[PDB]
Write a protein that binds this ligand. Structure first.
Ligand SMILES: O=C(O)c1cc(-c2cn[nH]c2)ccc1Oc1ccc2ccccc2c1
Ligand SMILES: O=C(O)c1cc(-c2cn[nH]c2)ccc1Oc1ccc2ccccc2c1
Ligand SMILES: O=C(O)c1cc(-c2cn[nH]c2)ccc1Oc1ccc2ccccc2c1
Lengths: 114, 114, 114
């Protein structure tokens, strides 16, 4: 999978090791090899949640399979847990969009995964 | 719903109060309490629209339902109108991608909306 | 169509003609007039691919049709080629997500493309 988090938390509040932690925990959660996991953290964003600029995050998780009802509830628990612990963002100020990608619609290494 | 704007307009040209105006106007247009609305504005972007670096915007609106032909036209008039008035972006230099999200594919507060 | 590239490559390493080159190459490759093509490059990103912070890129291509198996493979060879030549990113550290948008789900000019 590919995990993107946009947040109004400042860059200096993103701890050392965060990208590696996300990579490792997504590998653990999805069972997928870390060598194909991509993570992207975008701090200092101009955003509001419910009209408030208290800490919040808008995230997305794209996966070729491993997306579904129970899996997504599990990912949300995991990922909100990590954002709360490491970036001090309340889980009720986080949205995560999940996308099940067709392999033919993911390009990589001059081709696609089809 | 969640509304994201990426634009080459500089930060200093985003007016004070713009995130609140977007929240209010989206709540009114969708008939939803502002507590459910998230907004995100990303200025100073390196982008081109039709080969031109004149002011432009690439946006997205994600909603669990309430997406379709007529509603999307109405959102586009509202949102292009706001971007023209507040950021001085011509409506024909705006793209808005509309996404009808399944509740099971939106995470919030350690779970999903399913 | 709309092409977005997020990358950890620094802003200074993006050649000055890069947006125009993307616009022209995508117009050639998609058979669309360049007036319809939007391009967006986001450097200096905090991202990792396979746990590594070597240069990498996470991209997307949105089109109303002109998306599918062989077409996406051709787009990936073209776009990986440009990212390797111009930004010095290895093709095996690039993801490109392809999205076939319905015309009624793309807003533009106060309406949609429906
Ligand atoms: O299996 C996966 O989750 C997976 C997902 C992506 C991906 C990239 N963009 N969106 C999804 C890439 C590679 C993957 O592994 C093979
Ligand atoms: O208003 C929306 O559709 C909406 C959209 C997002 C969102 C965030 N990322 N992508 C979409 C989040 C919250 C939202 O409020 C809800 C939330 C649950 C619902 C469940 C059933 C019906 C309607 C709902 C509405
Ligand atoms: O026809 C197309 O491919 C096309 C696609 C877009 C687009 C912008 N965002 N997503 C899709 C815009 C204009 C187009 O013309």
């Amino acid at each position: 999978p590919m995990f993107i988090v946009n947040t109004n938390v400042p860059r200096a509040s993103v701890p050392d090791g965060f990208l590696s932690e996300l990579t490792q925990q997504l590998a653990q959660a999805t069972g997928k090899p870390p060598q194909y996991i991509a993570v992207h953290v975008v701090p200092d964003q101009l955003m509001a949640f419910g009209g408030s600029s208290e800490p919040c995050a808008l995230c997305s998780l794209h996966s070729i399979g491993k997306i579904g009802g129970a899996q997504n509830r599990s990912y949300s628990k995991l990922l909100c847990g990590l954002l709360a612990e490491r970036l001090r963002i309340s889980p009720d100020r986080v949205y995560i969009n999940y996308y099940d990608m067709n392999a033919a619609n993911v390009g990589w290494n001059n081709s696609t995964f089809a």
